[PDB]
Amino acid sequence: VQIVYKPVDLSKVTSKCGSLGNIHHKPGGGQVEVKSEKLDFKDRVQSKIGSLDNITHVPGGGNKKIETHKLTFR
Amino acid sequence: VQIVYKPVDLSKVTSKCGSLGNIHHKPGGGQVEVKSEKLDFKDRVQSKIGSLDNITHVPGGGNKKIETHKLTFR
Amino acid sequence: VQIVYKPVDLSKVTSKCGSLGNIHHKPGGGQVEVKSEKLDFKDRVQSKIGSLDNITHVPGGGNKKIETHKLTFR
Amino acid sequence: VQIVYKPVDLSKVTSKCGSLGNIHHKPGGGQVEVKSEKLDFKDRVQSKIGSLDNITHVPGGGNKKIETHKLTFR
Amino acid sequence: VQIVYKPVDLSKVTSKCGSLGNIHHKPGGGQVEVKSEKLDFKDRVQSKIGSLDNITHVPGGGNKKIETHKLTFR
Amino acid sequence: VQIVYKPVDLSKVTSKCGSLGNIHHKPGGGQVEVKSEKLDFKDRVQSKIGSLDNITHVPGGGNKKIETHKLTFR
Amino acid sequence: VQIVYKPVDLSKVTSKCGSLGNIHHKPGGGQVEVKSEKLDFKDRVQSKIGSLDNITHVPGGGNKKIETHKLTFR
Amino acid sequence: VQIVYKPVDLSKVTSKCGSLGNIHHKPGGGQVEVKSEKLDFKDRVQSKIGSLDNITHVPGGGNKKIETHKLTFR
Amino acid sequence: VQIVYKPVDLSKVTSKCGSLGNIHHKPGGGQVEVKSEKLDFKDRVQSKIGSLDNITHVPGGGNKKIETHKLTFR
Amino acid sequence: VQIVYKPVDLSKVTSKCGSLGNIHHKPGGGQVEVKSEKLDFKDRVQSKIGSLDNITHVPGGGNKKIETHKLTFR
């Protein structure tokens, strides 16, 4: 029983951008009304209730590598 | 019983952009009204209830590699 | 019993863009009204209830490679 | 019993675009009214209920390769 | 019992576009009214109920390769 | 020269209504596009140019008497 | 030369309404686009140019008497 | 030369309303775009240019009498 | 030359309303864009340019009498 | 030359209202953008340029009498 785990990974992620100019985020907010009474969350819940919200994201490169290696022997 | 796991991966993701000009995000917000009473979430729930929301995303390159390697021996 | 897993992968994703000009996202928001009483979510639910929402996405290259390698021995 | 998994993959995805000009997304929002009482979601549900929503996507290249390699030995 | 899996794949997807001019997406929204009471979704449901929605997509190249390789030995 | 102006006017306008029930005015608006260059209005002009508009009028009685008495001696 | 101006006016306007119930005015607005360059208005002009507008009028009685008495001696 | 101006005016305007119930004015606003360059108004001009606007009027009685008496001796 | 101006005016305006209930004015605002360069107003001009505006008027009785008496001797 | 100006005016304006209940004015504001360069106003101009504005008026009786008496001897 011989298991050889040898992932040869050569990877490059490259973003080339000269200049990012005028980014204008001007939002006139509104109205959010939320009515509830009983909220039950047990395990690993991500919940946003009644949000007015503004996200301006300007990453120079925004590159993301996700690598998962799982080996299980039963 | 011999298992040879040898994924030779050579990968390149390349975005070339000179300049990003005028990005204008001006939204006049409105009205969101949500009525509930009983909310039950058990396991691994992602829930957005009653949101007014504004996302401006300007990544220079926006490149994303997702690589999953799973080996299971039963 | 010999299993040789050798995926030779040479892949390139290339986006070349000189300049991105005027992107104008101006939306006049409206009205969203949602009435419920009892919401039950058990496992791995993604749910958006009562959203008014504005997404401006301007990636320089927007390239995404998804690679899944699964080997199972029973 | 010999299994040789050797996918030689040479692939290139190439988008060449000089300039992207005026993109104008101005939508006058309307009205969405949704009435329900009892919602039950068990496993792996993606549900959007009562949304008014605006998506402006201008990727420089928008190239996406999806590669799935599955080998199962029973 | 010898299985030789050797797909030699040489593939190129190429979009050449000089300039993309005026894209104008101005839609006057209307009215959507949806009435239900009991909704039951068990496994792997994708459901949109009561949406008014606006999608402007202008990818520079919009090229997508989908490759699935499945080998099963019983 | 004798002018006797004696209009004996006895007038009654009567509207009897018990109850006015559900009046529902929900119109999905559309699009109006009007192009002109030179507009000249001299005396007593009433002009509506490029209107999208919604009028809900529910008067309890809506009674209107118009009485004009003109006597001219030359 | 004798002018007797004696208009005996007895007038009653009567609206009787018990109750006015549900009046619902929910209009999804649209888009109005008006292009002009030169507008000249001299005397007593009433002009609405490029309006999106919503009027909900619920008068209890809405009764209007207009009475004009003009006597001119030349 | 004898002018007798004796308008005997007995007038009553009467609105009787028990109760005014639910008046709901919820309008999702839209978009108004107006382009002009040169506007010239000399005498007694009433002009609305580029308005998005919402008027909710609920007078208990809304009764209006307009009476004009003009006598001119030349 | 005898001018007798004796307008005997007996007038009553009466609004009787028991109770005014739920008046709900919730408007999701939109977007108004107005472009001009040169505006010339000489005498007695009433002008609204580029307004987004919300008027909720609930007078208990809303009764208005307008009476003009003009006598001119030349 | 005898001018007798004797307007006998007996007038009553009466609004009777028991109670005014829930008046709810919740407006989600939007966006107003106005561009001009040269504005010339000479005599008696009333002008509103670029306003977003909210007026809630709840007078108990809202009764207004306007009476103008003009006598001119040339």
Residue numbers in the entry:
A (entry chain H), B (entry chain D), C (entry chain B), D (entry chain F), E (entry chain J), F (entry chain I), ...: 306 to 379
Article sentences:
Alzheimer’s disease (AD) is the consequence of neuronal death and brain atrophy associated with the aggregation of protein tau into fibrils. The small molecule EGCG, abundant in green tea, has long been known to disaggregate tau and other amyloid fibrils, but EGCG has poor drug-like properties, failing to fully penetrate the brain. Here we have cryogenically trapped an intermediate of brain-extracted tau fibrils on the kinetic pathway to EGCG-induced disaggregation and have determined its cryoEM structure. Helical reconstructions of all three datasets revealed the Paired Helical Filament (PHF) tau polymorph, while Straight Filaments, a polymorph of tau fibrils usually found in AD at low abundance, were not present in sufficient quantities for structure determination.
As a negative control, we also collected and processed images of AD tau fibrils before incubation with EGCG. Reassuringly, our control map precisely matches previously published tau PHF maps. Three new densities alongside the PHF (Sites 1-3) were revealed in cryoEM maps of PHFs incubated with EGCG for 1- and 3-h. These new densities are not present in the map of our control, lacking EGCG. Moreover, the density attributed to tau exhibits the same backbone path at all time points. Our estimates are based on free energies calculated using coordinates of the control and 3-h structures. The results show that each tau molecule in the fibril is less stable after 3-h EGCG incubation (−28.1 kcal/mol/chain) compared to the no-EGCG structure (−34.9 kcal/mol/chain). In fact, we were able to determine the less disturbed control and 1-h samples to 3.4 and 3.3 Å resolutions.
